[PDB]
Amino acid sequence: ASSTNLKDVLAALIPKEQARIKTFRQQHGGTALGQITVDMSYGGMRGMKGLVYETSVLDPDEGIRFRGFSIPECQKLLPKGGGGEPLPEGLFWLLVTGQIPTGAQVSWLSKEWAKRAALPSHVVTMLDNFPTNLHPMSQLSAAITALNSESNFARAYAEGILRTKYWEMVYESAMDLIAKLPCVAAKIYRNLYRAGSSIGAIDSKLDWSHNFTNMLGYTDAQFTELMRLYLTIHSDHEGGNVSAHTSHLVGSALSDPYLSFAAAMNGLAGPLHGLANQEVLGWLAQLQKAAGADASLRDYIWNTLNSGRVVPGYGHAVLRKTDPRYTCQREFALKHLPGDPMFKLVAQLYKIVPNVLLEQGAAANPWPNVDAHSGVLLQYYGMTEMNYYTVLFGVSRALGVLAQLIWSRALGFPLERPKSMSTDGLIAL
Amino acid sequence: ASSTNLKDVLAALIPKEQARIKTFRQQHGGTALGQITVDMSYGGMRGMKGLVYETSVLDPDEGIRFRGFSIPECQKLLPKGGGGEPLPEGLFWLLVTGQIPTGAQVSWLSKEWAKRAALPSHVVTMLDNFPTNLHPMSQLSAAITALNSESNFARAYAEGILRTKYWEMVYESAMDLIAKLPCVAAKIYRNLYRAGSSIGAIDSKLDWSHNFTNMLGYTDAQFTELMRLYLTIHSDHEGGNVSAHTSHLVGSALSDPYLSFAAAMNGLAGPLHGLANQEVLGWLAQLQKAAGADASLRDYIWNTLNSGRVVPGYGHAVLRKTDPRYTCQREFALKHLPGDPMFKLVAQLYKIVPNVLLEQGAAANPWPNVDAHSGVLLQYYGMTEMNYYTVLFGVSRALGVLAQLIWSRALGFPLERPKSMSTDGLIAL
Ligand SMILES: CC(=O)SCCNC(=O)CCNC(=O)[C@H](O)C(C)(C)COP(=O)(O)OP(=O)(O)OC[C@H]1O[C@@H](n2cnc3c(N)ncnc32)[C@H](O)[C@@H]1OP(=O)(O)O
Ligand SMILES: CC(=O)SCCNC(=O)CCNC(=O)[C@H](O)C(C)(C)COP(=O)(O)OP(=O)(O)OC[C@H]1O[C@@H](n2cnc3c(N)ncnc32)[C@H](O)[C@@H]1OP(=O)(O)O
């Protein structure tokens, strides 16, 4: 008997994994997986094997994997809306469960997220009184923090539930959070860019991305497709990246999923992180201001470098080859907006940047990352408010970090609390 | 020529440290400082030497140090208001500079923080519309995120400043943040607990703590003294603790100090972290509800344990002996409120808990931590709104994390981006 329920699947999954991790540790907990050096400690744990994070694994040369599923693999394996791009819903299922969902599973996440999407009065209020000079990443983060009012986990905790059932409330809270997110994000959008307009209602018959673009105001059918891809690809990028790591660190203290997501957004908003999204367009926007020669384009790049600034959208702490996310993006444009002048510029830069970056001899990875390509795509569709882009990143990212947050609590991961040292102390060591 | 300026001192300090860290790394960057195991990775980096953090170092047996200054040492060495407890101002100087400040230095931080204390309209607004069921840690965090509007660093960055001058804007932003904090915190207090009342003005002639209690509404002279100690002791606790680590992680992406502090607060609000503050009182509050026998008190404790809950305010990821912060607290009460029934209970528990905790054989550290003693002190003074306590922790903590945030940027610390692994991956490794 019975129809679909992610929670039921998970309940089945948890105890097996549980057991599986126990014996492994029983046999290998003492095994040395690495060493730490002085440079690593000074260098942002660069290279340091530090976390267990299950939803995705990033390969230095190959790029991100979802099970072991590459982007291209997802591209073909996940269910599409009807109609060529994978549903972030399916991705989510994939992340949570390790398995490739059926259309019928997928339809359920949609329905579920459609059902959950409700904004509370205090929140709408705050969003409506916000200043327009308040950054949208700021706006997003305060709204989600403020949503914690609603936390099913924070309530359950207050009540004194047994630690074993943590995962259960975390899941409810994750699903509600995912559900609401597009409402919060579109509300911000509308407030700032479409004053006097309203987000409208969620149509339980749409996929989450389509509901999103509707609330955002986009009618173009290809844009919905872009949105579907975008939100899928930005999903997750293993645990060591600032955003995901932040959620993980904050969640380990047993701060509810709302608060953990919010902190994460605070990290996504740094220029070295998600904000690169935005920094790229603005850099391209300056660029054009000041159809150019490769040589001038080169002068332009040197000038940033000499200025002690970074070239946005190039480089990676872990990747060492061109991001497949980038490649993915490029292939979308090559299909859909191959003559876009902005597209063309971005293509052009790919020819130049890495080279200039090799010339300088400082970046360990001279290739482009996801951020280098994402704005170009949005602009083309009419979404030209660049200070907004990172919100979109913010929304996708929820899918991965929340998916993981649930396993962490499920596996009983403890407080993230490493040891620090001072220079004096280290020097003496 | 000239009078006092922390920024001038720092400018002198930065380049020396700079040079000092370069050679050390030149010689020892490759030196192995440790290994990582499977258990550490599964165990929240427990035991993992992972960060360089300069302002404070925590000793497993001795407890926290400020240079190398113990709490007792600070107690005697830092300037007092007239009149026995150290000024958090002095502490701050100490943290930033490595040196013990003069009264005249100290008076400057006071003046400076008095000058900087201004709240912006959008922020007051939001605070005033907040729901009363919105947790005060929630309220605090959204307000600080929302303050980012004002970021001098975020502006400078936008503008394209050279990376070398980062520290400079970070400092301005840190000082403004410290300045405003008590305004934000007292505004929350007043809104929730003293409806229709107003925080009043900052008197440039007071120390920061005294200004705080004024805005909070406390007249008792001993309470001001408590506040001074409290805010000093909660200052900083090396870099690996959830809050400080969070600020460090988020700041490494170049998210401004406002956003980094805010995320930190999201971590301070977890039950395993700062919220223990609050959880302790509520646990003592339940306790009393249900002058008791040691034996009943023991039954009570077992019942939590059997229930899969934690005993709040006991245990530590790093300490292995009774927190000196706790001892510090106890000695204050023994001077000032030795007959308090709540005080007496807390004294009583010290006799019992650790023992029950040794009995159970799970906590690695059976001794009490800072959180076990702090609420008792506040209650006595009339501050009995427990869901508020963590805000107070929040305020102190700014002193340490911000002090460090400035050195990080000053030393050019890179993006915090460790490597993660999945179980499968690790298993295969
Ligand atoms: C969503 C995401 O976050 S993907 C990345 C988004 N961010 C960006 O696009 C920002 C631009 N890129 C960068 O700043 C970096 O490449 C990062 C942060 C992504 C990686 O940082 P790290 O792992 O420390 O990089 P790396 O090891 O290559 O650093 C070596 C040196 O090259 C510099 N370098 C690296 N990337 C760049 C870049 N894009 N432009 C200029 N210099 C760079 C580093 O800043 C550093 O300079 P330093 O020695 O004075 O400190
Ligand atoms: C401001 C500050 O954060 S100071 C600490 C504030 N927090 C608290 O007071 C919360 C209560 N204490 C705790 O939960 C813990 O002692 C912590 C989080 C502070 C340390 O966590 P860890 O370093 O992983 O602790 P430890 O290594 O002792 O854990 C061993 C086991 O003992 C348990 N244990 C530790 N402390 C406690 C406690 N106070 N009550 C009951 N059980 C405890 C751990 O939860 C764990 O149980 P598990 O094996 O089912 O996961």
Whether residue B37 and residue A50 make contact (CB cut-off 8 A), yes or no, is no
Experiment type? X-ray
State the Cα–Cα distance between residues B322 and B103, nearest whole angstrom: 32
Sequence-ordered strand ranges (E) for B127-285: none
Coil, strand or helix at A52:
strand
Tally the C-alpha atoms within 13 A of residue B331's C-alpha that lie toward its C-beta: 12
The minimum CA-CA distance between A415 and chain B, rounded to whole Å, is 6
Q: Do A421 and B49 touch (CB under 8 A)?
A: yes
CA of residue A343 to ligand 1 center, whole Å: 23
- Selection from A167, A270, A248 nearest residue A417 by Cα: A248
Cα distance between the two ends of chain A: 64
Q: Find, among A342, A369, A348, the residue nearest to A300 by Cα.
A: A348
**Main-chain phi, psi angles of B30, to 5 degrees:** -85, -15
SS3 label, residue A253: coil
- A273 catalytic, yes or no? yes
Please name the member of A29, A262, A272 whose beta carbon is closest to the beta carbon of B39. Answer: A29
- Taking CB atoms and an 8 Å cutoff, what residues of chain B touch A57? 420-422, 425
Please report which ligand is nearest the Cα atom of A413. 2
Ligand 2 centroid–CA B303 distance in Å is: 17
**B194 is annotated as contributing to ligand binding:** no
Q: Residue A334 CA to chain centroid, in angstroms?
A: 24
Question: CA-CA distances (angstroms) from residue B389 to A253, A255, B141?
Answer: 17, 16, 14
Ligand 2 centroid – CA B18 distance (Å): 38
Name the phi and psi angles at B36, rounded to 5: -120, 140
Residue pair B378/B135 in contact (Cβ under 8 Å)? The answer is: no
Write the CB contacts of B123 (distance below 8 Å, at least 6 apart in sequence). Answer: B143, B146, B147, B184
Any residues with CB less than 8 A from the CB of B265 and at least 6 apart, and which? B137, B140, B141, B144, B243, B394
Q: How far away is chain B from the Cα of A400, in angstroms, using its nearest Cα? A: 14
Report CA(A189)–ligand 1 centroid distance (Å): 30
Q: From CA B83, how far away is CA B359, in angstroms rounded?
A: 43
3-state SS string for B23-81: HHHHHHCCCEEEEEEHHHHHCCCCCCEEEECCCCEEECCCEEECCCCCHHHHHHHCCEC
Q: Which ligand is nearest to the CA of B360?
A: 2
- CA dist B310 and A260 (Å) reads 21
Name chain B contacts of A270, Cβ cutoff 8 Å: 250-255, 259
Set of chain B residues whose Cβ sits within 8 Å of the Cβ of A253: 242, 267, 269-273, 275
Instruction: Spell out the residues 6+ positions from residue A255 whose beta carbon is closer than 8 angstroms to its own.
Output: A263, B266, B267, B269, B270, B271, B273
A389 lines ligand 1 (CB under 6 A): no
Please name the residues in contact with B27: beta carbons below 8 A apart, sequence gap of 6 or more: none
* Of A223, A202, A9, nearest in space to A115 by CA: A202
Q: Is B316 assigned a catalytic role?
A: yes
Distances (CA, A) of B47 to A96, A358, A415, B43: 29, 38, 12, 9
Ligand nearest to the CA of B368: 2
Bridge partners of A144?
none
Resolution at which this structure was determined, Å: 1.9
**A241 CA: nearest ligand 1 atom:** 3
Q: DSSP secondary-structure letter at A86?
A: B
d(CA A383, CA A375): 9
Q: Which two tokens stand for residue A230?
A: 């975008």
Angle at B202 between CA B200 and CA B205, to 5 degrees: 140
Cβ A234 vs Cβ A95: under 8 Å: no
One-letter amino acid of A269? A
Longest distance between any two alpha carbons in chain A, whole Å: 68
Burial class (CB in 10 A: 0-12, 13-18, 19+), B121: exposed
Report the alpha-carbon distance of residue A51 to residue B159 in Å, rounded.
36
Chain A residues with beta carbon closer than 8 angstroms to that of B424: 54, 68
Question: Number of CB pairs < 8 Å for A and B?
Answer: 397
Interface test with A, best of B417, B423, B427 (most A CBs within 10 A): B417
**DSSP-derived pairing of the beta strands A49-52 and B419-421:** parallel
Residue closest to B51 by CA, chosen among B242, B247, B245 = B245
Domains present along chain B, CATH in parentheses: 1-275+388-419 (1.10.580.10), 276-387 (1.10.230.10)
Task: Show me where chain A is broken: residue before each gap, C-N > 2.5 A.
Answer: 82, 290
CA dihedral A85, A87, A90, A95 (to 10 degrees): 90
